[PDB]
Amino acid sequence: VLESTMVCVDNSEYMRNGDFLPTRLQAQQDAVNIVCHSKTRSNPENNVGLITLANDCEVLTTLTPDTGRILSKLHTVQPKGKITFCTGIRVAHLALKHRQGKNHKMRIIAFVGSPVEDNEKDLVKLAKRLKKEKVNVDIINFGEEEVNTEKLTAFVNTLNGKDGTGSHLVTVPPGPSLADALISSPILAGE
Amino acid sequence: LDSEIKIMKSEVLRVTHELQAMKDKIKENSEKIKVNKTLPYLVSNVIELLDVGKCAVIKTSTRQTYFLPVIGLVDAEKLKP
Amino acid sequence: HKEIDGRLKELREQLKELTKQYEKSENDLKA
Amino acid sequence: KDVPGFLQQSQNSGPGQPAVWHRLEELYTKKLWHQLTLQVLDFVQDPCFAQGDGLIKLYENFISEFEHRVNPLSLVEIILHVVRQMTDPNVALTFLEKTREKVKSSDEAVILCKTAIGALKLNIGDLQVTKETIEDVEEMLNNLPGVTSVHSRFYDLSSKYYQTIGNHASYYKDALRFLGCVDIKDLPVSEQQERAFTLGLAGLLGEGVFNFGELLMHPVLESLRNTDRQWLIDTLYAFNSGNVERFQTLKTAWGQQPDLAANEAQLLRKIQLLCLMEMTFTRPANHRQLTFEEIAKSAKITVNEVELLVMKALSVGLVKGSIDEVDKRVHMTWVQPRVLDLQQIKGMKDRLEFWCTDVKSMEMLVEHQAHDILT
Amino acid sequence: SVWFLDHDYLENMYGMFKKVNARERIVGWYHTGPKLHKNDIAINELMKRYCPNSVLVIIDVKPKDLGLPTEAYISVEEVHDDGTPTSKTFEHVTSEIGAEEAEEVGVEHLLRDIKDTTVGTLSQRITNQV
Amino acid sequence: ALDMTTLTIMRYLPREVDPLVYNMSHEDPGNVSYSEIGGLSEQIRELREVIELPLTNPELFQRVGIIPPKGCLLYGPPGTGKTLLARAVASQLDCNFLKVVSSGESARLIREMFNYARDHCIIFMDEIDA
């Protein structure tokens, strides 16, 4: 399944939260490494880029078939600022549109552990817009679940519409291991 | 413990790839230098050596004198006059 | 593990040597 | 462990705070290690710690077992919060030094710690060392990408140091920079009403500060307009538009302030200089020939020292030109520009209107006359 | 506030241009917009990773008649001595148009048909004054 | 260092020190000591009457020395101490030796030699014989 994925990564201060041993930062690093490797092993023609969600969004790596560069550029990501989920997602959509290979499915997996402070109306509008441009926004929730779970359900339900298994939500309030939670998840299971 | 395995797994998986990239595009750079150093050189002297980096006032065996602001591929091994 | 500080030293050395190699390489290309 | 034990004990043995201990300690057990970084501030700023060594106990126990991973800047901020209610300066210097040693990665945290220790040296005296640390932290503060509350704290420190050393001009500059860095509205109205007054005094007595403009428009001065000190704003406005008559009128008060009363002569000289500057600025280049009688009718002096006043102006660099005292007039060919008012800019707009009209008329004349040879 | 400047493409092109010519390092960026945008500061922040003194140059494709087509800006963020809140904004940089000799030859050849005399003829001098 | 193609002066360079420098007797420095001349003390004392010229200039002012003399003849048998005789005295003087050999081409060479020298000090032009 020829795939182009964008891994959005929160690097807000709340990643200083240390529920996931040893730290949320190292946990998300391990999870992104695992998911990128899983995407690459299946049909290596797939390409993966990476986005940093900080005070202002950034794209650390565009769609590439390699994973070591993405790991290396993420390793130096430190917790700073606050998350801007909407801008991060829009940047991800722009990167998907600009991807060199037009024969790929459009996926965006977002490590979004944070309280998403955005307006619900524009939120649902963005979700529907992405559904229109045929995007699959998988969302990994680890953090303020009590706050963002309903909004993430809105994300995924609006994206799916009817029978739309493209977009998925995986929430992990418990913190045994983020990497293991991700590997034993529906998103990576189908690959 | 876990920190040891972390620094022996993730640090390794990143740093080894970094060194691999460096040592591959060093191969590319060295190959380009080797292609640009095509054999038919013009045997010449280093009559005078100056500094400003270093320079040269080489005396080409075609009874000619050429100042070089950049010495070039040579190792700058003191290149005595 | 025996390899922790040994690998740290080996890295440091290899990185500095290769960075000097690239200083000279790019200097030669610009020359 | 000892930290959980203290947490459970002060769950009810702590000041006020019925269940915030419950939430703080359940988060600490959750091992977030940062979510309570905000609660610590929000509670320590409460009017509960004023002279309590319990805050130091809290710090020691759980901040020592907690500092291994915390926002370095927030950690240093809470460090200063604890230090405030500690009255052992000799040990406070060492405490702050160990906090520095703990926090090395965060350059900004180092900045703020250096500022705090310099502030403590200032509070105990030690002018030479506080100046040395001010210079050090300044030169290694002008190395970061942008501005921040750390710059705010440094500029406040520098303002305080220059106030205590008496360098009014440098104090004025640094305090203005500090007010620029920090948000005006976040400060208490009392803090404003005081900082604005101190800036007014520094500008009023500063060597080389003639630009009292920019301050009547700085919003920090929105604290004396209706207060019982709008007088100060009035006086500063008088200097901005040098009105030695109005300043003598306002003499009814500033004789009360000992510093200004002592430095009357400096005030009079500075206002005379500003009056001459503003007169020259008002006069157009057509008839910028100021007269001795004019300067006499201006800031009150007989015509035997307008010469010396103009000499002082030229030497300081306020204006440029010459003084023909044979004909008893002064030629001004420059003025040091300053900050202006909306009406002073409307006048400039009118003058431009005229200039544009003249240029357009001459353009049309030349174009029509030479129409047959224009390429 | 959402844009997708391609850093990977930037670095690849910069590397190939280094290979072709070496005494040309990334010195800034340009955008053909008559006016700035809120994204200009962010993109200059992005470019400052490739150049410390990164300079924006707005090159207006729409041809004017009084001034040069290039406006230069340098991003300076400093505590305003004014005492006002400080925001990371641009500052104008003096700009000029100059040419290599190998570019002067091409420019003159391309303009040979509509060139003016490189001498002051009275009509042209009066026109220049106008 | 002219440009190769357009022949434009790109940078000035230090003068070349060709082998025709030292062989031209252009050694400025070089002293050993005063005690090596075992005898010859009277001649040393006499030659130290040329030290007045530099250390002061009362030759100007009341009197005139027509640019006071430039040394004495050092009349010597086949060879006793000539070179070292001058060496020790000038080492005391702190001056430096521009020794010269006189053993129209050679005339012009020596002329240019001292023309380069004097711009900089004992000159020791010798070898008049033959």
Ligand SMILES: Nc1ncnc2c1ncn2[C@@H]1O[C@H](COP(=O)(O)OP(=O)(O)O)[C@@H](O)[C@H]1O
């Ligand atoms: N008074 C002296 N004391 C010690 N050595 C002497 C004395 N006179 C001559 N010599 C030796 O003889 C040599 C004479 O050299 P020089 O003076 O250059 O030639 P000439 O004596 O023919 O003028 C010197 O190198 C020195 O070693």
